[PDB]
Amino acid sequence: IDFSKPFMSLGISIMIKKPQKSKPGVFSFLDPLAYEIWMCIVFAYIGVS
């Protein structure tokens, strides 16, 4: 058959799952340390006092 001129140029692309904006949590300033450290600091604080 004899095609006509392309009316839509395309190709092979890459599709991935759209990511999320990862809205920071309210209490995210605690993230640098683990929950165990934060809990142990309170225990250490009480003990020292």
């Binding site: 340390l33 683990a34 250490a44 003990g47 020292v48």
Partner: protein
């Protein structure tokens, strides 16, 4: 990068509790000495 675990700062906790035990020992030794004196 993960949040620091207790295993990263475990040694300073041991030093702190050791210091708290040493201070109690030191304090009670003075108390024990003074009590004997008088």
């Amino acid at each position: 990068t993960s949040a620091l675990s207790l295993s990263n700062v475990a040694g300073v906790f041991y030093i702190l509790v050791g210091g708290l035990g040493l201070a109690m020992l030191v304090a009670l030794i003075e108390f024990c000495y003074k009590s004997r004196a008088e």
